[PDB]
């Protein structure tokens, strides 16, 4: 007759046991009569034993920098076995919290990338990528690309298909993200892609034309950036929107009282670059809109048109600017992700 056998997911004496997984204990040739786990001043850890008595597991988050002790006994027809195991979990040098966009339960446009922004520089980009599980339905190929040391993005090759569900599980709790930096917590979000909405600003016509699922629904005369401060060409992702906002050039590197600085309150503002390009109300230039460029790079349009754009365009919709004298919007702007060729995006930069 067989002696019961105990198998724990930790070994007695271990150090740097990671806290991304539950701790478990299994009986063979018998059943579990007692399992307790206790931290280093006696508080019980909390867990659940399967109905068949074979498998026990912790049910709550385990702590960084803890010394836990696990006592288990198995009883069988042919005897008893008891073990005591003591182990120490990872003690980070630092913690980093991830922040995910877009918002949970949001409906976003077809240009919206998955964004995971860490509040510290990530030394092991690959470990971060690996901890982030993205589910798509319908499934589509995508890839990670890092905009800077803290923020990674995931997206498909092409604009999302309307009706796609996107799920993002950032499972960074207990993960060593490099040089003793570990995840502070897990985060989750789920969003859905909505209608296809692409607004094109053509500098040859000075019109911003808004297309919803391939159809023109609005034509907006506009005044883009003057030759000395032109609007960059390329694909811009729509971000945040404001009933009114004080636009302050010092927010974007540029001192208010320098030659290209400004501080002005404007209405009906939709952000389309982190470099500070917005679509907004410009009563002062209604004359020029349709004819000449007068701005610092913003898409000046009429008050009714900026408000229309506020109401009808959402986060993740697209604006494409073409034929200006400017360059191309940088890939790494923050809202310029689609300007990076797919082959480069896909190869990634996890080193």
Short mmCIF file of C-alpha atoms in Angstrom, two decimals:
data_model
loop_
_atom_site.label_atom_id
_atom_site.label_comp_id
_atom_site.label_asym_id
_atom_site.label_seq_id
_atom_site.Cartn_x
_atom_site.Cartn_y
_atom_site.Cartn_z
CA UNK A 1 0.00 0.00 0.00
CA UNK A 2 1.28 3.41 -1.18
CA UNK A 3 2.49 6.32 1.01
CA UNK A 4 0.69 9.64 0.03
CA UNK A 5 2.92 12.08 -1.95
CA UNK A 6 2.87 15.90 -1.75
CA UNK A 7 3.97 18.14 -4.63
CA UNK A 8 4.17 21.89 -3.98
CA UNK A 9 4.81 24.56 -6.66
CA UNK A 10 7.55 25.97 -4.46
CA UNK A 11 10.54 24.29 -2.92
CA UNK A 12 11.53 24.65 0.72
CA UNK A 13 14.36 27.11 1.05
CA UNK A 14 13.66 28.95 -2.26
CA UNK A 15 14.35 32.65 -2.70
CA UNK A 16 13.00 35.10 -5.40
CA UNK A 17 9.77 33.12 -5.86
CA UNK A 18 7.69 35.24 -8.19
CA UNK A 19 4.36 36.42 -7.26
CA UNK A 20 2.70 36.33 -10.71
CA UNK A 21 1.33 32.81 -10.06
CA UNK A 22 -0.62 31.16 -7.29
CA UNK A 23 1.13 28.70 -4.91
CA UNK A 24 -0.28 25.18 -5.05
CA UNK A 25 0.06 21.77 -3.39
CA UNK A 26 -1.07 18.47 -4.82
CA UNK A 27 -1.70 15.05 -3.20
CA UNK A 28 -1.11 11.72 -4.98
CA UNK A 29 -2.02 8.30 -3.48
CA UNK A 30 -4.17 10.18 -1.05
CA UNK A 31 -6.00 13.31 -0.25
CA UNK A 32 -5.16 16.64 1.46
CA UNK A 33 -6.20 16.72 5.13
CA UNK A 34 -4.64 20.10 6.05
CA UNK A 35 -3.04 22.91 4.13
CA UNK A 36 -2.16 26.30 5.59
CA UNK A 37 0.08 29.05 4.39
CA UNK A 38 1.10 31.87 6.68
CA UNK A 39 3.25 34.95 6.22
CA UNK A 40 6.21 35.83 8.46
CA UNK A 41 4.13 36.89 11.42
CA UNK A 42 1.43 34.28 11.32
CA UNK A 43 -1.41 35.80 9.24
CA UNK A 44 -3.13 32.98 7.26
CA UNK A 45 -2.89 33.35 3.47
CA UNK A 46 -6.20 32.09 2.14
CA UNK A 47 -6.76 29.46 -0.39
CA UNK A 48 -9.12 26.74 -1.47
CA UNK A 49 -8.95 23.02 -1.70
CA UNK A 50 -10.61 21.28 -4.69
CA UNK A 51 -13.71 19.19 -4.01
CA UNK A 52 -11.85 15.97 -4.72
CA UNK A 53 -9.28 16.88 -1.98
CA UNK A 54 -6.38 16.58 -4.41
CA UNK A 55 -5.41 20.24 -5.12
CA UNK A 56 -5.02 23.33 -2.97
CA UNK A 57 -4.18 26.78 -4.17
CA UNK A 58 -3.76 30.28 -2.86
CA UNK A 59 -6.69 32.51 -3.93
CA UNK A 60 -5.40 36.02 -3.24
CA UNK A 61 -2.52 38.10 -4.29
CA UNK A 62 0.76 37.22 -2.72
CA UNK A 63 3.12 39.91 -1.50
CA UNK A 64 6.50 41.16 -2.54
CA UNK A 65 9.21 40.76 0.05
CA UNK A 66 7.46 38.08 2.16
CA UNK A 67 8.64 34.89 3.84
CA UNK A 68 5.70 32.45 3.71
CA UNK A 69 5.49 29.06 5.32
CA UNK A 70 3.36 26.27 3.91
CA UNK A 71 2.29 23.26 6.00
CA UNK A 72 0.49 20.40 4.22
CA UNK A 73 -0.53 16.89 5.18
CA UNK A 74 -1.83 14.19 2.88
CA UNK A 75 -3.75 11.11 4.19
CA UNK A 76 -4.23 7.92 2.16
CA UNK A 77 -5.35 4.35 2.72
CA UNK A 78 -1.63 3.51 3.03
CA UNK A 79 -0.39 6.25 5.41
CA UNK A 80 0.21 9.95 6.05
CA UNK A 81 2.81 12.49 4.87
CA UNK A 82 3.45 16.00 6.15
CA UNK A 83 5.74 18.72 4.86
CA UNK A 84 6.67 22.25 5.90
CA UNK A 85 8.15 24.57 3.28
CA UNK A 86 9.47 28.09 3.79
CA UNK A 87 10.30 30.38 0.88
CA UNK A 88 10.87 34.06 0.10
CA UNK A 89 9.19 35.98 -2.69
CA UNK A 90 10.84 38.61 -4.99
CA UNK A 91 11.83 41.83 -3.26
CA UNK A 92 11.87 44.56 -5.93
CA UNK A 93 14.34 47.49 -6.10
CA UNK A 94 11.47 49.50 -7.71
CA UNK A 95 7.89 49.15 -8.78
CA UNK A 96 6.25 50.44 -11.95
CA UNK A 97 2.56 50.89 -12.58
CA UNK A 98 1.15 50.44 -16.13
CA UNK A 99 -1.67 52.71 -17.46
CA UNK A 100 -3.75 51.46 -20.39
CA UNK A 101 -5.58 53.38 -23.06
CA UNK A 102 -8.13 53.52 -24.45
CA UNK A 103 -10.71 53.39 -21.64
CA UNK A 104 -12.55 50.31 -20.49
CA UNK A 105 -15.92 49.85 -22.27
CA UNK A 106 -15.03 52.60 -24.76
CA UNK A 107 -15.95 52.61 -28.41
CA UNK A 108 -13.04 54.03 -30.45
CA UNK A 109 -12.12 54.71 -34.05
CA UNK A 110 -10.29 52.48 -36.52
CA UNK A 111 -6.88 54.12 -35.80
CA UNK A 112 -6.79 53.52 -32.07
CA UNK A 113 -3.72 51.64 -30.94
CA UNK A 114 -3.51 49.68 -27.70
CA UNK A 115 -1.32 51.83 -25.38
CA UNK A 116 0.46 50.60 -22.25
CA UNK A 117 2.29 53.45 -20.51
CA UNK A 118 4.58 52.58 -17.55
CA UNK A 119 5.40 55.33 -15.06
CA UNK A 120 9.13 54.30 -15.11
CA UNK A 121 11.67 53.38 -17.84
CA UNK A 122 11.46 49.72 -18.74
CA UNK A 123 14.84 47.97 -18.90
CA UNK A 124 13.44 44.63 -20.18
CA UNK A 125 11.01 45.58 -22.96
CA UNK A 126 10.67 41.96 -23.96
CA UNK A 127 9.43 40.92 -20.52
CA UNK A 128 6.86 43.69 -20.68
CA UNK A 129 5.61 42.59 -24.14
CA UNK A 130 5.42 39.06 -22.97
CA UNK A 131 3.25 40.03 -19.95
CA UNK A 132 0.67 41.81 -22.11
CA UNK A 133 -1.95 39.54 -23.61
CA UNK A 134 -3.99 41.02 -26.45
CA UNK A 135 -7.12 39.25 -27.70
CA UNK A 136 -8.87 40.40 -30.89
CA UNK A 137 -12.23 39.26 -32.35
CA UNK A 138 -12.22 38.91 -35.31
CA UNK A 139 -8.57 37.94 -34.66
CA UNK A 140 -6.00 39.99 -36.47
CA UNK A 141 -2.24 40.12 -36.58
CA UNK A 142 -0.61 42.92 -34.61
CA UNK A 143 2.69 43.77 -32.95
CA UNK A 144 4.28 45.85 -30.23
CA UNK A 145 6.36 48.95 -30.82
CA UNK A 146 7.87 51.29 -28.23
CA UNK A 147 7.35 55.04 -28.64
CA UNK A 148 9.86 55.89 -25.88
CA UNK A 149 11.28 54.15 -22.82
CA UNK A 150 7.95 54.01 -20.98
CA UNK A 151 5.17 53.59 -23.49
CA UNK A 152 4.53 50.57 -25.78
CA UNK A 153 1.85 50.36 -28.45
CA UNK A 154 0.17 47.47 -30.19
CA UNK A 155 -1.67 47.63 -33.44
CA UNK A 156 -2.54 45.84 -36.66
CA UNK A 157 -1.05 46.39 -40.09
CA UNK A 158 -4.06 48.22 -41.30
CA UNK A 159 -6.79 50.23 -39.65
CA UNK A 160 -9.09 48.08 -37.50
CA UNK A 161 -12.22 46.61 -38.97
CA UNK A 162 -15.40 48.11 -37.49
CA UNK A 163 -17.00 45.83 -34.89
CA UNK A 164 -13.71 44.26 -33.63
CA UNK A 165 -13.55 43.54 -29.88
CA UNK A 166 -10.18 44.21 -28.33
CA UNK A 167 -9.12 42.87 -24.92
CA UNK A 168 -5.90 43.88 -23.14
CA UNK A 169 -4.59 42.01 -20.07
CA UNK A 170 -1.50 43.61 -18.60
CA UNK A 171 -0.28 40.88 -16.28
CA UNK A 172 2.73 42.66 -14.89
CA UNK A 173 2.17 41.91 -11.20
CA UNK A 174 5.11 39.80 -10.04
CA UNK A 175 7.02 40.18 -13.28
CA UNK A 176 10.62 41.28 -13.34
CA UNK A 177 10.67 44.01 -15.94
CA UNK A 178 14.48 44.37 -15.62
CA UNK A 179 17.08 45.76 -13.14
CA UNK A 180 14.92 44.84 -10.16
CA UNK A 181 11.88 46.71 -11.48
CA UNK A 182 8.69 44.76 -10.97
CA UNK A 183 5.07 45.40 -11.79
CA UNK A 184 3.05 47.21 -9.13
CA UNK A 185 -0.18 45.65 -10.29
CA UNK A 186 -2.09 44.14 -13.16
CA UNK A 187 -4.42 46.16 -15.33
CA UNK A 188 -7.17 45.33 -17.81
CA UNK A 189 -9.22 47.08 -20.42
CA UNK A 190 -11.57 46.06 -23.15
CA UNK A 191 -12.73 48.23 -26.04
CA UNK A 192 -14.56 48.02 -29.28
CA UNK A 193 -13.96 49.55 -32.67
CA UNK A 194 -16.77 51.68 -34.06
CA UNK A 195 -17.45 53.32 -37.40
CA UNK A 196 -14.72 54.12 -39.84
CA UNK A 197 -14.15 57.92 -39.76
CA UNK A 198 -11.31 59.45 -41.76
CA UNK A 199 -10.98 63.21 -42.24
CA UNK A 200 -8.62 64.32 -44.95
CA UNK A 201 -7.05 67.83 -45.01
CA UNK A 202 -5.71 68.59 -48.53
CA UNK A 203 -3.42 71.65 -48.67
CA UNK A 204 -4.16 72.02 -52.42
CA UNK A 205 -7.83 72.71 -51.61
CA UNK A 206 -7.67 73.91 -47.96
CA UNK A 207 -10.64 71.67 -47.14
CA UNK A 208 -10.93 69.05 -44.39
CA UNK A 209 -13.36 66.42 -45.64
CA UNK A 210 -14.91 64.03 -43.20
CA UNK A 211 -15.81 60.53 -44.49
CA UNK A 212 -17.93 58.12 -42.41
CA UNK A 213 -17.69 54.57 -43.92
CA UNK A 214 -16.44 55.86 -47.20
CA UNK A 215 -19.11 58.68 -47.59
CA UNK A 216 -18.48 62.45 -47.40
CA UNK A 217 -20.61 63.87 -44.58
CA UNK A 218 -18.83 67.19 -44.02
CA UNK A 219 -16.61 69.54 -45.99
CA UNK A 220 -14.76 72.12 -43.77
CA UNK A 221 -12.79 74.97 -45.22
CA UNK A 222 -9.64 75.19 -43.11
CA UNK A 223 -6.51 77.29 -42.44
CA UNK A 224 -3.50 75.13 -41.65
CA UNK A 225 -0.02 76.16 -40.56
CA UNK A 226 1.75 78.97 -42.40
CA UNK A 227 4.85 78.18 -44.43
CA UNK A 228 7.16 79.01 -41.49
CA UNK A 229 5.21 76.78 -39.04
CA UNK A 230 3.52 74.27 -41.40
CA UNK A 231 1.22 71.38 -40.55
CA UNK A 232 3.05 68.13 -41.04
CA UNK A 233 1.61 65.69 -43.64
CA UNK A 234 0.66 62.16 -42.59
CA UNK A 235 -1.77 60.15 -40.53
CA UNK A 236 -2.84 61.58 -37.18
CA UNK A 237 -4.88 59.61 -34.61
CA UNK A 238 -7.63 61.58 -32.85
CA UNK A 239 -7.14 61.84 -29.10
CA UNK A 240 -8.92 64.06 -26.56
CA UNK A 241 -11.49 66.73 -27.10
CA UNK A 242 -12.27 69.93 -25.34
CA UNK A 243 -15.24 72.26 -25.21
CA UNK A 244 -12.54 74.84 -24.66
CA UNK A 245 -8.87 74.68 -23.73
CA UNK A 246 -6.02 77.07 -23.15
CA UNK A 247 -3.45 76.20 -25.74
CA UNK A 248 -0.06 76.99 -24.27
CA UNK A 249 2.98 76.60 -26.51
CA UNK A 250 5.24 75.97 -23.48
CA UNK A 251 3.36 72.69 -23.05
CA UNK A 252 5.05 71.70 -26.41
CA UNK A 253 8.65 72.90 -25.94
CA UNK A 254 8.06 76.47 -27.20
CA UNK A 255 8.28 79.48 -24.79
CA UNK A 256 5.15 81.58 -24.95
CA UNK A 257 7.16 84.75 -25.66
CA UNK A 258 9.38 83.31 -28.38
CA UNK A 259 8.60 84.02 -32.06
CA UNK A 260 6.40 80.87 -32.46
CA UNK A 261 4.96 80.83 -28.96
CA UNK A 262 1.38 81.47 -28.09
CA UNK A 263 -1.09 81.21 -25.26
CA UNK A 264 -4.70 81.36 -26.39
CA UNK A 265 -8.06 80.09 -25.26
CA UNK A 266 -9.99 78.29 -28.06
CA UNK A 267 -13.21 76.47 -28.35
CA UNK A 268 -14.20 73.11 -29.70
CA UNK A 269 -10.70 71.60 -29.75
CA UNK A 270 -9.85 68.05 -30.88
CA UNK A 271 -6.26 66.94 -30.30
CA UNK A 272 -4.52 65.07 -33.13
CA UNK A 273 -0.80 65.22 -32.20
CA UNK A 274 1.22 65.34 -28.97
CA UNK A 275 3.34 67.97 -30.77
CA UNK A 276 0.13 70.01 -30.24
CA UNK A 277 -1.82 69.98 -33.49
CA UNK A 278 -5.56 70.42 -32.81
CA UNK A 279 -8.64 70.92 -34.96
CA UNK A 280 -10.42 73.93 -33.40
CA UNK A 281 -12.64 76.99 -33.70
CA UNK A 282 -10.96 80.02 -35.23
CA UNK A 283 -13.38 82.92 -35.72
CA UNK A 284 -10.36 85.22 -36.40
CA UNK A 285 -9.41 83.27 -39.59
CA UNK A 286 -12.80 82.37 -41.16
CA UNK A 287 -11.73 84.69 -43.97
CA UNK A 288 -8.49 82.74 -44.68
CA UNK A 289 -9.99 79.23 -44.26
CA UNK A 290 -10.40 77.78 -47.79
CA UNK A 291 -7.64 80.02 -49.20
CA UNK A 292 -4.53 80.62 -47.14
CA UNK A 293 -2.64 79.05 -44.22
CA UNK A 294 -2.28 81.25 -41.18
CA UNK A 295 -1.82 79.02 -38.09
CA UNK A 296 0.99 77.70 -35.97
CA UNK A 297 0.12 74.24 -37.48
CA UNK A 298 -3.39 73.77 -36.13
CA UNK A 299 -6.36 73.02 -38.39
CA UNK A 300 -8.30 76.22 -37.99
CA UNK A 301 -11.97 75.80 -39.01
CA UNK A 302 -15.24 77.65 -38.38
CA UNK A 303 -16.94 77.55 -34.99
CA UNK A 304 -19.84 75.39 -36.23
CA UNK A 305 -17.35 73.06 -37.98
CA UNK A 306 -15.13 72.65 -34.86
CA UNK A 307 -18.13 71.91 -32.76
CA UNK A 308 -19.38 69.50 -35.45
CA UNK A 309 -15.95 67.80 -35.28
CA UNK A 310 -16.18 67.65 -31.44
CA UNK A 311 -19.60 65.98 -31.55
CA UNK A 312 -19.11 63.58 -34.52
CA UNK A 313 -15.42 62.58 -34.39
CA UNK A 314 -14.20 60.30 -31.55
CA UNK A 315 -10.91 59.12 -30.02
CA UNK A 316 -9.13 56.80 -32.48
CA UNK A 317 -10.69 58.33 -35.63
CA UNK A 318 -8.22 59.46 -38.24
CA UNK A 319 -7.11 62.69 -39.79
CA UNK A 320 -4.84 62.55 -42.78
CA UNK A 321 -3.00 65.65 -43.90
CA UNK A 322 -1.65 65.78 -47.48
CA UNK A 323 0.23 68.17 -49.81
CA UNK A 324 1.46 70.73 -47.20
CA UNK A 325 4.94 72.22 -47.30
CA UNK A 326 5.75 70.48 -44.01
CA UNK A 327 7.49 67.18 -43.49
CA UNK A 328 5.87 63.98 -42.24
CA UNK A 329 4.49 63.70 -38.65
CA UNK A 330 6.96 61.63 -36.59
CA UNK A 331 6.08 57.96 -36.01
CA UNK A 332 6.76 58.39 -32.33
CA UNK A 333 4.78 61.59 -31.80
CA UNK A 334 2.28 59.85 -29.57
CA UNK A 335 -0.53 60.04 -32.18
CA UNK A 336 1.62 59.33 -35.26
CA UNK A 337 1.89 55.52 -35.01
CA UNK A 338 0.49 54.81 -38.47
CA UNK A 339 3.33 56.71 -40.16
CA UNK A 340 5.77 53.92 -39.27
CA UNK A 341 5.94 51.30 -42.08
CA UNK A 342 4.49 48.00 -41.03
CA UNK A 343 7.73 46.12 -41.58
CA UNK A 344 9.50 48.37 -39.15
CA UNK A 345 6.58 48.39 -36.65
CA UNK A 346 6.36 44.61 -36.75
CA UNK A 347 10.08 44.00 -36.32
CA UNK A 348 9.60 46.06 -33.15
CA UNK A 349 12.33 47.60 -30.97
CA UNK A 350 12.27 45.42 -27.84
CA UNK A 351 16.11 45.99 -27.84
#
